[PDB]
Design a protein around this ligand. Structure first.
Ligand SMILES: *CCC1=C(C)C(=O)N[C@H]1Cc1[nH]c(/C=C2\N=C(C[C@H]3NC(=O)C(CC)=C3C)C(C)=C2CCC(=O)O)c(CCC(=O)O)c1C
Ligand SMILES: *CCC1=C(C)C(=O)N[C@H]1Cc1[nH]c(/C=C2\N=C(C[C@H]3NC(=O)C(CC)=C3C)C(C)=C2CCC(=O)O)c(CCC(=O)O)c1C
Ligand SMILES: *[C@@H](C)C1=C(C)C(=O)N[C@H]1Cc1[nH]c(/C=C2\N=C(C[C@H]3NC(=O)C(CC)=C3C)C(C)=C2CCC(=O)O)c(CCC(=O)O)c1C
Ligand SMILES: C=CC1=C(C)[C@@H](Cc2[nH]c(/C=C3N=C(/C=C4\NC(=O)[C@H](C)[C@H]4CC)C(C)=C\3CCC(=O)O)c(CCC(=O)O)c2C)NC1=O
Ligand SMILES: C=CC1=C(C)[C@@H](Cc2[nH]c(/C=C3N=C(/C=C4\NC(=O)[C@H](C)[C@H]4CC)C(C)=C\3CCC(=O)O)c(CCC(=O)O)c2C)NC1=O
Ligand SMILES: C=CC1=C(C)[C@@H](Cc2[nH]c(/C=C3N=C(/C=C4\NC(=O)[C@H](C)[C@H]4CC)C(C)=C\3CCC(=O)O)c(CCC(=O)O)c2C)NC1=O
Ligand SMILES: C=CC1=C(C)[C@@H](Cc2[nH]c(/C=C3N=C(/C=C4\NC(=O)[C@H](C)[C@H]4CC)C(C)=C\3CCC(=O)O)c(CCC(=O)O)c2C)NC1=O
Ligand SMILES: C=CC1=C(C)[C@@H](Cc2[nH]c(/C=C3N=C(/C=C4\NC(=O)[C@H](C)[C@H]4CC)C(C)=C\3CCC(=O)O)c(CCC(=O)O)c2C)NC1=O
Ligand SMILES: C=CC1=C(C)[C@@H](Cc2[nH]c(/C=C3N=C(/C=C4\NC(=O)[C@H](C)[C@H]4CC)C(C)=C\3CCC(=O)O)c(CCC(=O)O)c2C)NC1=O
Ligand SMILES: C=CC1=C(C)[C@@H](Cc2[nH]c(/C=C3N=C(/C=C4\NC(=O)[C@H](C)[C@H]4CC)C(C)=C\3CCC(=O)O)c(CCC(=O)O)c2C)NC1=O
Ligand SMILES: C=CC1=C(C)[C@@H](Cc2[nH]c(/C=C3N=C(/C=C4\NC(=O)[C@H](C)[C@H]4CC)C(C)=C\3CCC(=O)O)c(CCC(=O)O)c2C)NC1=O
Ligand SMILES: CCC1=C(C)/C(=C\C2=NC(=C\c3[nH]c(C[C@H]4NC(=O)C(C)=C4CC)c(C)c3CCC(=O)O)/C(CCC(=O)O)=C2C)NC1=O
Ligand SMILES: CCC1=C(C)[C@@H](CC2=N/C(=C\c3[nH]c(C[C@@H]4NC(=O)C(C)=C4CC)c(C)c3CCC(=O)O)C(CCC(=O)O)=C2C)NC1=O
Ligand SMILES: CCC1=C(C)[C@@H](CC2=N/C(=C\c3[nH]c(C[C@@H]4NC(=O)C(C)=C4CC)c(C)c3CCC(=O)O)C(CCC(=O)O)=C2C)NC1=O
Lengths: 277, 164, 177, 164, 177, 164, 177
């Protein structure tokens, strides 16, 4: 009636109507529900899946990949409600100074997600287990959550990034108040990136200011603009960001160790450098 | 505050653009709806006292157990407080009514009200009895213009649907 | 971020009373004004690019020490930063024109600009000179007395409004110095 | 697309609120400015051919060196490319004019046009000669209604101020 | 995210021509409709909380297996997740009512909801039943024939609009199954 | 669930260490406090029925206006629901009491209860009247052992102090 | 993460009733056991690193293709990742010993391990061999019959516990294959 192709891609009916011989368990694992994903718009959801498969129709686990996508986009919405709470956009989500910038922002973010997918398997496994372990530590004994982190690879990564955004505990949203916290904070960040890559050769993804020619300068300009908006913030915002960054980086990176617990509570911008993710 | 021109200027600021014709049409709708809800604001500043008085009197007319000696409002000072609270609510309806939008009301009255009212043993159903009393006593032609009255209805309903 | 409405409301909230007919009367002057402000903002936002180009080019024209080596306009990088700064300033001025209150200009652009330019060694007198040129160009467009481009609009009185826009440019120029 | 109702719905959607009265007045201003813009859209779909023809003819009337045999537009096929590109531009002005705002025009025409025009040795000043020719040949009462005309002026100016 | 306008524009762009006079007539039916839609959205968004509560309470009323232990409504956690889901559904429906096109509802909410409920074990029949109850309650409010609250509106014909809203809820109910 | 051994194993898992003597002493205190809590669990599984019956009867003995025809509990099915709701609560006090900690109670009963109770017009003071009735009817020597009784008191107080 | 206690509670919650006497009696066997499990965990957690060293060294000894070039254990980096994997395996096994239920081991470590080793090309039979040697070494330390280290304990029967720990290692070894 239909085709050989399309009947591979379709679906499966019921045992009473669509097929007589009672189908087995393997045929639900192999054909089943077939949906390929959208092209993903963030580095946090970029390296976890296939996106598509021309000439293959998987089933029953594509339910799970689809479910992780929808839970993960449900994650981003809420952590963006945090920056736009009163229905008026705060300075957190400005996304440009000049008129033509935002499209170039979109393209840089997009190809950064494609380069996040190009980096090899061992590295991405490393980041999956690291982020999984990190979400379990932020789960706070909630059992429902712990099931839903052991299974979800995307929801973990946007859970971490998302919470680092909405808490404001970022490296770029916190400005140190001294020259000692400048040098300490700088040194901490350097040591994090050196712990990531001891090869001495830049690794696909990572920082990557340059994709096409004339990117690097816009990167410099968007960076400085975000530094100026980071500078203009209120008292309330600053103090909340410092408490948040101190606590959060303690809960993730200070394990009843009075030295680092002290040097987090002492200087919060070092903690905000310790937040990473 | 959440309003028309602050949403559009906030969106142009978040986008990083010059304010195009879209924001101009938004503030066009603001300056066209304005006169109605400012008339409603004038009359609310007219007779807020009788609004609060009938609101609280009908509020304890429904819920008598509050002046019993468990529940909170069982002293003259706290009935003065219940009345004081409802006066703040009508003043916020006047403020957000002047502004346009729910921003003045939302950030002063609604945000964080759940922990305070839940903490201090305050039932929401008493407030809802007050507001629905005012909304049923409202009027179509006699005091106000009908159109502006609809604006008033909206704001009051927003309060109810932000409360429970 | 507060318009003229939110300014009324905030002042009455500090006073802790109702809105009332007096403040509402001044607000009915605002609403009743209306399309003069609309058309004004349409005029400045239309010719915005050209204002920024002329103003900054004039600013370089009065003292050529900026384009001299060791001046703050000596490179394409510093010239670019210069152009984007003039553009952002004009952007927020137009925002303050739609708002009717300078809250957005005080919070989003003015808050920490002096400190910034002093930390970067930007000569503040040259910036106030460019803000002054943007003032004159913007008032000339807003009164439709621009000597190149003169588009058809209803003729009435638009002086008040010119004084408002001059107030905003004088706020920026007073802030940068 | 950037427009009135998509800005308000987008703002409510990002915030996660039900649509308050502020968005209602914004779409009220849309429905009030709408007829003026739509009529201008009708006339643009009317006589776009002569618009493009006078636009390009006056564009090469200003810049003759383009049909010289260095610079790009020096063959009949590329002068054809001139007229189709200006035709694209007027069609985007029609689109954005109908939508309301600059969203249709900005995302199709403006976004990344700088790399293409800068790469393929295309001068922007020739386009601006075309658009300013059309803007000076425009009219107040004779073809259009004044009000709607203003909306057209805005769109055309936007292109110029997005181009150089 | 596309309204009426953007839908007409997209279709004319695929057709690669100007919008033209004819499409604009259907858009003049939209613009000429206008405040019917405004007052309608105001009605649904006014009584929104009460709709969500009644629909979910009704859904528990038809089969008490949900509140039975092991049912998906059995705990305070699962009940709350239930109510926020009803709320967000109603929210996007109202967004689709002002928009005039279902694009915001198709993109922002519908795209991957089925698979999500399948993977969480939410009974889809019961969800389409709740979407149906919200449909009936929302149409009754939008026609102002609601049995408890009946407010003043200048009279007229508003059946068209009710059919539009019914179409959006049938899109969600068809999507969750 | 939040408990002794899950806090310690969760802390060792988040830290990435072998389980040292500190967790061993924690589970030592678990296996030493275990008998007092378990005994209380036995007696709660003994007479939960009369606990719920006296709890709800004294709950409407205090608050009569609930069976009036405004407020919720004015129908036989919803008084059945108030009774079942309190039976769920005593069952969660038995579960948490057997586990050790408030984890079973917190993730089933408390998490998300604010939205539900605030939504469905449910006053907390009726629950608190029920639980404080049970806590005042409790006993020192006659039904239970004193020390285990204290455990019961703590869990019930936790419910009260997680409610309002 | 569910211990013995939470297993009893979850099973009684699916049964939807009170915990009951029968389950509490088995729980009194657990709690009444107690410091045998404490001393057992103390034994395995004491000699843990040395168990991991011996078991991985024996695993390389049975088939020298691991250390042969192109084998998984070739080079220092792979050998270090090998040693930390054996260490983390034993760590979660000891967590399952204090917990009394394998929920921590099923959720935190086992959930997606076979797929991971298949994606990395880790030979699963060699991992099951390593888990088997850790099983026998851990049972020999847990019964204090180890031929190198024999510390003083009050004597008695630890046989029941040893079956539990062997059940957890058989869960890991069955899971990796
Ligand atoms: C965290 C990512 C990272 C690590 C680690 C590292 O060692 N350095 C970066 C990547 C990196 N970036 C460049 C090159 C440039 N990066 C910029 C952007 C910055 N310059 C600015 O002025 C500002 C705003 C204040 C920013 C954000 C620029 C402009 C360049 C040079 C561009 C060019 O045309 O060459 C490099 C290469 C240089 C190097 O560090 O060796 C690397 C590795
Ligand atoms: C508080 C919200 C509200 C106001 C105010 C009001 O006037 N009525 C409601 C909204 C409303 N609900 C319906 C329709 C139905 N509502 C239910 C749910 C109830 N029926 C039950 O048996 C139970 C459990 C005992 C509940 C909670 C049902 C089943 C319907 C009819 C569904 C159908 O298929 O038609 C309506 C529309 C009817 C009307 O009142 O005009 C409204 C406005
Ligand atoms: C910050 C987290 C934000 C919150 C909160 C929010 O509601 N939205 C964010 C800020 C925001 N962004 C825009 C406008 C644009 N943002 C763009 C960038 C994205 N577009 C892309 O294609 C990609 C790569 C896949 C990214 C990262 C772009 C482009 C725009 C439109 C630019 C334009 O010229 O208009 C806005 C305004 C739109 C709105 O949401 O109302 C806001 C508030
Ligand atoms: C951000 C960008 C981004 C991408 C571009 C993809 C790229 C990508 N594809 C796969 C994975 C895959 N990609 C394909 C696709 C193919 N099937 C074929 O018949 C064709 C050769 C080809 C389509 C043209 C298949 C079949 C797999 C699974 C391969 C397998 O498991 O054997 C994987 C490994 C993870 C996974 O299984 O999903 C990745 C990273 N993922 C991303 O995150
Ligand atoms: C004692 C037990 C106990 C729990 C079980 C939790 C349950 C819980 N989670 C959240 C709150 C939250 N929980 C999640 C978790 C999710 N992110 C997703 O992508 C998934 C759908 C899901 C993990 C599987 C998120 C994202 C929030 C914040 C939601 C938001 O602010 O938008 C809150 C509100 C307070 C807060 O913000 O922390 C509560 C009570 N809390 C407790 O006290
Ligand atoms: C300016 C302030 C400042 C700090 C406060 C530190 C904080 C810090 N510590 C580490 C890194 C580290 N810190 C510790 C310390 C710990 N060992 C334990 O047994 C305890 C839990 C804890 C001591 C109480 C260890 C072991 C590492 C290395 C972790 C590893 O590589 O596994 C790193 C990563 C870079 C590195 O490897 O050095 C950083 C940024 N660094 C700074 O620049
Ligand atoms: C800007 C807006 C704004 C409000 C709306 C109020 C809301 C509000 N009310 C109270 C506080 C109070 N509000 C009431 C009112 C009540 N008495 C009852 O019998 C009824 C249930 C109810 C009136 C309908 C009472 C009695 C208190 C004191 C409660 C107590 O101390 O027990 C408090 C705590 C501070 C205080 O004690 O005053 C606040 C923030 N305050 C504000 O700033
Ligand atoms: C949707 C909107 C839209 C536009 C506005 C155009 C814009 C545009 N024009 C060209 C491309 C071109 N455009 C022109 C036009 C010019 N010839 C001259 O003499 C004048 C300077 C100028 C007319 C006024 C020419 C000649 C080319 C080809 C350039 C070349 O190949 O050298 C290209 C590259 C692709 C191509 O070769 O067609 C694009 C994107 N295209 C679009 O999709
Ligand atoms: C900013 C907020 C905002 C609103 C909420 C609306 C409110 C609104 N509705 C109408 C006007 C109207 N509103 C309705 C609506 C209906 N009548 C029925 O009997 C049905 C129950 C219901 C279906 C939706 C009708 C039928 C009219 C009159 C017909 C019309 O004007 O098209 C008018 C015209 C002026 C007047 O009547 O005084 C206005 C302003 N407009 C706005 O600007
Ligand atoms: C796992 C724990 C757990 C609980 C503790 C309950 C809590 C709870 N109660 C209700 C729901 C309810 N609970 C009550 C109870 C009350 N009647 C009154 O007169 C008193 C104020 C109060 C008893 C003291 C009533 C009447 C309802 C129905 C409310 C309504 O539909 O109006 C609901 C909504 C679902 C439903 O209708 O059943 C929930 C989640 N459910 C759970 O799953
Ligand atoms: C905080 C740390 C901590 C520990 C490490 C344990 C240590 C510990 N073990 C026992 C006691 C004991 N420990 C063992 C253990 C065994 N005997 C064998 O012959 C086997 C080799 C081995 C299997 C595990 C036995 C059999 C007893 C005695 C029986 C019993 O008390 O149940 C006792 C009882 C008191 C005593 O003996 O003086 C204590 C405190 N308890 C703790 O609180
Ligand atoms: C829900 C997430 C959220 C986000 C993503 C947010 C703001 C935000 N940060 C953004 C960017 C952005 N924010 C970060 C933050 C960051 N850097 C860090 O080291 C850590 C730990 C971070 C997380 C807070 C980076 C790396 C970027 C990319 C660099 C860049 O694009 O400039 C953007 C995109 C546009 C822009 O540059 O402003 C946005 C819109 N506000 C939020 O609430
Ligand atoms: C030789 C170095 C040099 C320059 C460069 C100019 C720059 C310049 N433009 C001015 C001011 C100025 N500039 C413009 C904008 C400009 N005019 C237009 O009609 C159009 C279309 C424009 C952009 C293309 C306007 C509209 C004014 C206001 C005066 C007027 O009505 O033209 C002023 C007066 C400043 C003041 O009033 O304080 C100066 C100095 N002058 C110089 O000496
Ligand atoms: C040549 C390649 C090679 C190896 C490497 C070993 C590895 C090895 N150790 C074993 C088993 C084993 N290993 C140890 C641990 C070890 N012994 C101690 O006394 C101390 C202090 C230790 C760490 C330093 C113990 C305690 C046992 C149990 C047997 C015993 O009682 O010694 C077993 C028996 C496995 C079984 O029972 O199934 C093997 C195969 N064997 C090999 O053929």
């Amino acid at each position: 009636v239909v085709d050989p192709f399309q009947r591979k891609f379709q679906s499966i009916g019921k045992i009473g109507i669509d097929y007589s011989r009672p189908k087995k368990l393997a045929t639900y694992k192999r054909v089943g529900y077939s949906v390929g994903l959208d092209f993903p718009n963030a580095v946090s959801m970029a390296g976890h899946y296939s996106l598509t498969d021309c000439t293959r129709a998987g089933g029953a686990a594509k339910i799970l990949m689809k479910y992780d996508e929808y839970c993960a986009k449900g994650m981003l919405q809420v952590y963006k409600r945090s920056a736009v709470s009163t229905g008026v956009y705060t300075t957190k989500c400005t996304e440009a100074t000049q008129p033509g910038v935002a499209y170039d922002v979109r393209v840089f973010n997009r190809t950064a997600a494609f380069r996040q997918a190009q980096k090899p398997v061992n590295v991405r496994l490393g980041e999956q287990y690291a982020a999984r372990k990190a979400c379990v530590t932020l789960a706070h004994n909630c059992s429902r959550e712990e099931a839903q982190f052991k299974n979800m690879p995307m929801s973990c990564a946007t859970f971490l990034a998302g919470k680092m955004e909405a808490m404001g505990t970022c490296y770029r949203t916190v400005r140190p108040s001294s020259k000692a916290e400048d040098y300490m904070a700088g040194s901490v960040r350097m040591q994090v990136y050196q712990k990531g890559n001891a090869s001495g050769v830049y690794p696909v993804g990572g920082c990557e200011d340059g994709h096409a020619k004339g990117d690097a300068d816009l990167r410099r300009v968007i960076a400085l603009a975000s530094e100026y908006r980071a500078a203009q913030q209120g008292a309330a915002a600053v103090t909340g960001a410092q408490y948040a960054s101190s606590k959060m980086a303690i809960q993730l990176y200070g394990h009843s160790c009075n030295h680092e617990e002290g040097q987090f509570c002492d200087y919060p911008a070092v903690a905000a450098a310790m937040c990473r993710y | 505050m959440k309003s028309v021109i602050t949403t559009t200027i906030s969106a142009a600021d978040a986008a990083g653009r010059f304010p195009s014709s879209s924001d101009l049409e938004s503030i066009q709708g603001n300056i066209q709806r304005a006169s109605a809800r400012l008339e409603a604001a004038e009359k609310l500043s007219g007779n807020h006292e009788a609004v609060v008085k009938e609101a609280g009197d009908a509020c304890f007319a429904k819920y008598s157990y509050l002046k019993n000696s468990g529940e909170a409002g069982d002293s003259q000072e706290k009935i003065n407080k219940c009345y004081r609270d409802v006066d703040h609510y009508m003043r916020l309806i006047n403020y957000s009514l002047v502004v346009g939008g729910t921003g003045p009301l939302d950030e002063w009255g609604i945000a964080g009200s759940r922990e305070v009212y839940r903490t201090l043993n305050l039932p929401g159903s008493a407030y809802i009895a007050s507001f629905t009393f005012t909304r049923d006593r409202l009027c179509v032609p006699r005091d106000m213009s009908s159109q502006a009255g609809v604006e008033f209805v909206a704001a009051l309903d927003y309060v109810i649907n932000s409360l429970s | 971020m507060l318009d003229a409405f939110s300014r009324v409301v905030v002042n009455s909230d500090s006073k802790a009373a109702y809105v009332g007919g007096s403040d509402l009367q001044s607000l009915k002057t605002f609403i009743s004004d209306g399309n003069k402000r609309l058309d004004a903002v349409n005029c400045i936002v239309s010719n915005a690019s050209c204002i920024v180009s002329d103003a900054i080019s004039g600013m370089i024209c009065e003292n050529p020490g900026l384009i001299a080596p060791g001046g703050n306009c000596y490179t394409n990088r510093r010239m670019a930063a210069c152009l984007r700064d003039g553009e952002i300033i004009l952007r927020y001025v137009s925002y303050a024109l739609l708002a009717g209150d300078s809250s957005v200009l005080d919070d989003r652009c003015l808050n920490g600009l002096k400190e910034t330019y002093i930390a970067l060694g930007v000569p503040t007198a040259s910036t106030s000179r460019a803000v002054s040129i943007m003032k004159a160009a913007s008032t000339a467009f807003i009164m439709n007395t621009a000597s190149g481009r003169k588009i058809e609009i209803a003729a009435g009185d638009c002086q008040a409004l010119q004084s408002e826009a001059a107030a905003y440019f004088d706020k920026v120029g007073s802030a940068v110095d």
